[PDB]
């Protein structure tokens, strides 16, 4: 039944609990309020990396080491990818992180890269440095909602072309609404993601119940004991 | 076999991998270097809360709601308990958090309580406000290594007495070396915890391989695909 009421796609859990989508703006408002009450970006980046890497370890079978190609953009969504990549590298996954070069440094990127640099992971700026043969998993964090001209950039188009030619299944962490992912990972509550997001999962990102209430969402947890759950149309 | 070499108790994993203890001083050094490289306290508090709550949810049976009494001190170890408590509350566990009153405020406590206040959790400063009947789980975060006189304090002795009389099993998150815990949770690498720690588990707190090397530890992950693992003598 319906325990989450928003003030547009609707999903349900394995147990039948309805989880509706929220708009980009309401998701942004929710996170801002969460941040005001002490759930900082750095905290969320850390938790998102742990919980995403747990999901990806499940996708990798979770018993040579499996190989993951991580495709990150120069934005906060790409920083979430680097966190996930560091946690995977910490757990003996062969991680190759692609991130194009840029000039305007971003705090979250700088911080995640600093920790990633101390792992056995490989950071590359060229798509040619990525494996030729299909990897076990591609993780896609190339696109960000705030960069409307990002999808027109040659570097982006090449990265997408690389993912399509590799043949490994694609997990997209926190993709935008408008690469065909095998799976996609929504955070907190889903945006109205469509068929190109593939199999949709939801990740808990630490948001207390009353933060939802403050933005006019009547929220009850759809997670049970799990931090990442499958969602169905 | 031995893939973790330190410059004192030794544990092993289910698969036979040897995990040695390290001194308090080396553990402190390890985390300081981790911090220097961007693994801030706030990130670790969030991660520790997630992974400890995941462990606690397994102890709770991982399916009325289960009930947890959280006993925290006015210190960083107590802040780790509050983090675990907020994550449990987010997952529909009935959480009652004990923290005694104090005057010298602490950033980590303040930030964790701010988030916990927005959950359905209950914060209390009196032991009489805790259940009269056995709860499902007691989580102990009462003691901290930095305070040698803490155990002499009436408030602490009372809290320990409360835990001993409740009948519920006790999980101790990150206890000091010198309450008989059923299980204890070590972080990153274990201290030489003895028999009063009960069944010892190790939690991944997100520390990259090369941070260990910088403090003289030849480290290889004992975790496999798990973020919390049981250790045996």
CATH superfamily of chain A: YjeF N-terminal domain
Quaternary state reads homodimer
Rg of chain A: 17 Å
CATH structural class of chain A: Alpha Beta
Number of structural units classed as domains of chain A: 1
Termini gap of chain A: 14 Å
Major protein interface:
A-B, 45 and 45 residues
Strand order of the largest sheet of chain A: 5-4-3-6-7-8-9-10
Number of strands of chain A: 10
Count of helical segments of chain A? 6
Percent in strands of chain A = 15-25%
Report the CATH topology name of chain A: Rossmann fold
- In terms of structural class, how would the helical and strand content of chain A be classed? alpha/beta
Helix content of chain A: 25-40%
Shape of chain A: globular
- Major β-sheet profile of chain A: 8 strands, mixed
CATH architecture assignment of chain A: 3-Layer(aba) Sandwich
String of helices and strands of chain A: EEHHEHEHEEHEEEHE
PDB class: protein binding
Keywords: hEdc3, Phosphoprotein, protein binding
Assembly: dimeric
Entry title: Crystal structure of human Edc3p
């Amino acid at each position: 039944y319906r325990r989450i009421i928003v003030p547009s796609k609707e999903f349900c859990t394995d147990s039948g609990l309805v989880v509706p989508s929220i708009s980009y703006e309401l998701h942004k408002k929710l996170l801002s309020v969460a941040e005001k009450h002490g759930l900082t970006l750095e905290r969320r980046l850390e938790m998102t990396g742990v919980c995403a890497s747990q999901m990806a370890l499940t996708l990798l079978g979770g018993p040579q080491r499996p190989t993951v190609a991580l495709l990150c953009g120069p934005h906060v969504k790409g920083a979430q990818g680097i966190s996930c990549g560091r946690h995977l590298a910490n757990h003996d996954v062969q991680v190759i992180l692609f991130l194009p070069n840029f000039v305007k440094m971003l705090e979250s990127i700088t911080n995640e890269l600093s920790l990633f640099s101390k792992t056995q992971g490989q950071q590359v700026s060229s798509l040619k440095d990525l494996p030729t043969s299909p990897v076990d998993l591609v993780i896609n964090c190339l696109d960000c909602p705030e960069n409307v001209f990002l999808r027109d950039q040659p570097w982006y188009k090449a990265a997408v072309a690389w993912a399509n030619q590799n043949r490994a299944p694609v997990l997209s962490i926190d993709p935008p609404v408008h690469i065909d992912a095998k799976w996609s990972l929504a955070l907190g509550l889903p945006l109205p993601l469509g068929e190109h997001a593939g199999r949709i999962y939801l990740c808990d990102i630490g948001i207390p119940q009353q933060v939802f209430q403050e933005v006019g969402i009547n929220y009850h947890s759809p997670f049970g004991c799990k931090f990442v759950i499958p969602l169905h149309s």
